[PDB]
């Protein structure tokens, strides 16, 4: 059981994914491992990038702000069904990792970046529930409340365990473990508040907005401060800083579904996410500094959520300057998924290099 | 005059109440001291636990949400009068400590945990004023404003001195002194805003909500971070973390009396306090890990304030799920006061062990 | 190019303006330098103190709360025209410093206190635009929007560069550079939101309130914590702590011009600024501890902005206690400008000691 400070000392990268040049590991480097050891949990980010595109292309087809485009609702069918086959494929071959190689699953659970991808399978299930195709689900005002209790049940249980460790004083408190991926532990409170309103429970939705709001302020302020996260915070603007955009984008969508209006509390959350979007994508090294990794799928997710919030802003404020803002953020987000979709098929079948040896879990406990 | 870092180095416990095994002290250990040296200031927490129960049992008898119980208003008489004899008894035998043993009162004033119990005598006086029995005070719309100026006068003067030391840069700023008991310096801004509304001054009440709100956010965020408070922050969930519940509970009651409605600002404060309540009391080691101390009286206080805020939530949201929540939080809080009431009478008169030698004030200034 | 930690190690004072007793510098101490090296950027604070008095004396003459005084609107003429000759005089002789001595301008740009006075020339231009005399500008509902784009254009470009460096992880992030003068990088978001409303753009004004609100909370919380700013944070209450008052004062004026009412969000910002005003000016050492410096002009600025916010509070809450509060804050602020105006004319022409050798820029890069 490896300490949290030992992962920062032995690993290197914005995600702690490479071993340093002077570290010894417990497994061979050049021999090919069995497949269930080379399969990380970070490929639930492929499911986050696809299931968030099914929320967008239903909003583009069913909103009065974008009626002039005449977008067919069959784009939501093919993205919802393809995101549901990938989700049932990744989840089945990760349960087989827990049966045969459970000692490697525990190394990922205490890795300070990969804690937050255990929240990720249950956020994908809530994106597929607030965006069901109307071909499958007609004639309904409310979803059934048992859809909420099965998906937000294990999210809330794992949330009590992690948040209780943050405010206590031993060895995994937030000042020793924080990184930009810690925002993924907060954003499911706002996705779960949208899905609680659409089963008919507006007071449980107000409960989940307030626990997500209080823990967003703690993580946002603590990342501006002097704490032993050294290599996981890059020296200049990296694409990993897109995780800041996800929680104010989902907080403004959630407050609009609860109260029915895009008021001054919902605009303040939307305009914080829009400043962080501009100060990250409006550069020249964001486009020319592209190198593929599977962690790019999870950086697309919070830029698609910000496109959904600017469609709902274009409904409250009508006119041409808000139509043009909503169509230019939802063009950049879908054009990166199409780049990631083709370069994932080329790395899998033409070059065969999606799954190398996962060397970051095999480090030694004690020595440098 | 002992430095703040020397109290953390020489003392041990969640309240800094025991000396470590290698420390020498200025007074004998086994010989019995005079009584006014063995009498701490932390037994103003007995008055906080009793005077907060008089606010609850008047709310249970005078609210339309709990009319079906037919609770007599003579439970408020016997708790208000018993909390007023204990308050005039503790305050008289602490003035005699200041006359004869003022050098020991100064050691408690610079102790980083026991600073906050100098705010405590004036919060008890405001709990007894917002909960007077209607047998004594009938036919009144407003209290007299001089009741506010005598009790909130010395609270506000001592507040300017302490908060000015927090933001400055010398030797007792908040990053060097912070602990969970520092929330007791913030909560009297919200109790004083309830009592300012009930004398007819709604603009002074809005002033006191805003100074309590800004300093709640500073103390809440700074306890998640790397600062030299080492032993006063336990490694797992201790009952000392109930001090987090007190200030969001009183902030939601105060905003309701000012504006007359339990709106979306008042619900956000109530739902933060309810999450911290669940993640602290809904365990198995909260009930089986009971050891008596007089510091338990002060951990009952913020769980009674959270019962008052859920009675006022049951009035805004009518129906059976909010009646059952209000009756289950106000059962847990009154059943712990009844445990503490019997075990305080047994430790005082049957075993005679309430007041041992107060060894934490007699430490040396310099050496380890 | 000198590191940020080397400025804190080699310089001494609340503004880092003196060299320590064991430091060697690159230029002579006793020989008189050329004039463009002895001319700091901190004398844009003379323009901040004068242009903020033109906003006050137009509010005193055009508000229904202060109609009983019959103040002539010719006090706004003589202060607006005098603040506009000083602004065009300081700006012309600083462009000549950039042409001939650009290596000294770069030493001021990386000095951790003097970064924030590069934002200062564009805040002065927005104070002169929201307070134009009605003799020059009659018969207008809205200003032209190109007035906004020329003054807030270079403010917003320099804001993206600095705020992007704060949240990243290399060498000039906020935990390594913070001081009380860092609030001057935040306050132009609220002055620019007042001027965006008065050209007819209320959605750009709501964008600028939200970016200024989120970065106010980061700077306010980070100054309560343990970071290597050592000498720039004085041990007791210095006049440099008046920079805390500026941003909540301008945030309450800005929210009132956008929404047209002084509601519960605007009162919470005003009452935070009023507590910080009382806990800084209501002492005896604030008045008897007066020593002149040119940095005093910039400490007058946030006490004049707090006088403008209490005139607008006296309009929402009518009655004698709010008239007397507005006239006693706007008397203290104008009586210090009159002290600073006479002591600046005496130090310039009678004693000739406004511009000594600016020794803080000539330090060596490496050794102590």
Residue numbers in the entry:
A (entry chain C), B (entry chain A), C (entry chain B): 150 to 517
Excerpt from the paper describing this PDB structure:
Slow anion channel 1 (SLAC1), an S-type (slow) anion channel of the SLAC/SLAH family which is preferentially expressed in guard cells, has been identified to be mainly responsible for the stress-induced anion efflux and thus playing a pivotal role mediating stomatal closure. Though assembled into a trimeric structure, each subunit of AtSLAC1 functions as an independent anion pore.
We turned to the phosphorylation site mutants which had impaired anion currents and might be stabilized in an inactivated conformation, specifically, the S59A mutant, which has been shown extensively to trim down AtSLAC1 activation and stomatal closure and also has notable reduced currents in the HEK293 cells. In this study, we report the structure of a SLAC1 mutant from Arabidopsis thaliana (AtSLAC1 S59A) in an inactivated state at 2.7 Å resolution as determined by cryo-electron microscopy (cryo-EM) single-particle analysis. In the built atomic model, the N-terminus starts at residue 150, and the C-terminus ends at residue 517. Pore radius analysis of the AtSLAC1 structure reveals that the upper half of the channel is wide open to the periplasmic side of the cell, whereas the lower half is completely sealed. Thus, the AtSLAC1 S59A mutant is in an inactivated, closed state in our determined cryo-EM structure. A large part of the cytosolic domain composed of the N- and C-terminus is clearly identified and forms a plug-like structure which interacts with the transmembrane domain (TMD) and blocks the anion pore, hence inhibiting channel opening. To be noticed, the intracellular surface of the transmembrane domain has a positive electrostatic potential, while the plug has a complementary negative electrostatic potential facing the TMD, suggesting strong electrostatic interactions between the TMD and the plug. E164 in the N-terminus forms a hydrogen bond with Y448 in TM9, and D166 in the N-terminus forms an ionic interaction with R263 in TM3. Besides, R263 also interacts with D507 in the C-terminus. Although the Y448A single mutation retained the activated anion currents, the S59A/Y448A double mutation did not exhibit apparent anion currents. Taken together, breaking the interactions between the intracellular plug and TMs can trigger AtSLAC1 activation even in the absence of the key site phosphorylation, and the cytosolic plug observed in the AtSLAC1 S59A structure, especially the N-terminal tail, may serve as a pore blocker prior to phosphoactivation.
